[PDB]
Amino acid sequence: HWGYGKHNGPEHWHKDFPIAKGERQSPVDIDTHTAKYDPSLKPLSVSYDQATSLRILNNGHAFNVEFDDSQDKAVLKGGPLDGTYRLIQFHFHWGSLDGQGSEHTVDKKKYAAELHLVHWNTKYGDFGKAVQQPDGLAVLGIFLKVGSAKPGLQKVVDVLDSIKTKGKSADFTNFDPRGLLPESLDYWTYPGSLTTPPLLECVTWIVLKEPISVSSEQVLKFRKLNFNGEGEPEELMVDNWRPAQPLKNRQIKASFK
Numbered sequence: 392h393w394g395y396g397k398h399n400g401p402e403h404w405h406k407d408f409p410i411a412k413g414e415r416q417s418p419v420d421i422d423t424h425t426a427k428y429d430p431s432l433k434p435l436s437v438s439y440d441q442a443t444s445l446r447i448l449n450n451g452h453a454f455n456v457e458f459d460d461s462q463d464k465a466v467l468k469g470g471p472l473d474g475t476y477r478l479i480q481f482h483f484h485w486g487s488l489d490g491q492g493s494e495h496t497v498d499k500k501k502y503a504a505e506l507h508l509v510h511w512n513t514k515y516g517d518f519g520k521a522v523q524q525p526d527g528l529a530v531l532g533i534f535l536k537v538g539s540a541k542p543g544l545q546k547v548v549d550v551l552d553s554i555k556t557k558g559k560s561a562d563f564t565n566f567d568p569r570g571l572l573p574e575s576l577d578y579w580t581y582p583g584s585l586t587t588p589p590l591l592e593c594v595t596w597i598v599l600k601e602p603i604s605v606s607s608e609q610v611l612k613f614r615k616l617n618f619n620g621e622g623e624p625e626e627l628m629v630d631n632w633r634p635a636q637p638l639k640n641r642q643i644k645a646s647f648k
């Protein structure tokens with residue numbers, strides 16, 4: 392099945408998921424000179440004070456930090472969005488080396504990693520229904536550069552040993568995702584897709600301009616994870632990013648001047 396190797400990576404996905412060659416695929420390159428400022432865009436409202444993290448899971452493609460999404464406890468609103476989007480999980484994409492790892496690029500620059508906070512539109516009742524709708528999801532994307540450590544990431548880093556291989560989970564309560572955000576909420580936005588199969592075209596992307604800094608030691612720990620299950624040949628979980636896809640008939644809008 393699908394993955395990030397030579398034989399099963401992004402360049403193969405279209406055979407099982409023909410929407411891979413669709414009109415609104417993600418990620419994309421953000422050309423900062425052609426993204427236009429849209430004064431009609433609102434500030435983003437990120438309301439994470441009541442967020443309830445539950446568990447962390449290695450799904451064989453990344454690790455997900457999962458939230459209780461059975462009530463409006465952590466929500467995204469405003470910005471480009473109409474209505475209320477509930478946080479369900481976050482995860483990262485990262486590289487084998489610090490010079491690659493992000494999915495989106497900025498003027499063809501690749502960051503070391505990219506954080507995706509995934510939210511679903513409450514008007515559709517559940518995640519599974521939301522991903523069938525063109526406005527079903529809102530994903531907040533945050534770039535990671537290597538420099539100073541991110542204190543708010545360390546709790547995630549230190550549990551990774553317990554979820555080394557595919558299918559492992561661990562309790563992960565009381566984690567506050569506010570500690571993963573940069574200072575500024577200035578963003579770019581465009582309509583796109585999930586970046587992993589099934590590649591559904593259901594996402595409003597909100598990509599923050601300001602990266603967070605993580606330390607080399609933090610990223611090194613991500614790269615010790617495994618794609619494989621327990622007692623299988625070890626294949627380090629690295630380079631779990633899809634490259635930029637054609638922009639097609641889309642415009643990228645900026646919230647800032």
Ligand SMILES: [Zn+2]
Nearest residue numbers: 482484507586
């Ligand atoms: Zn992602």
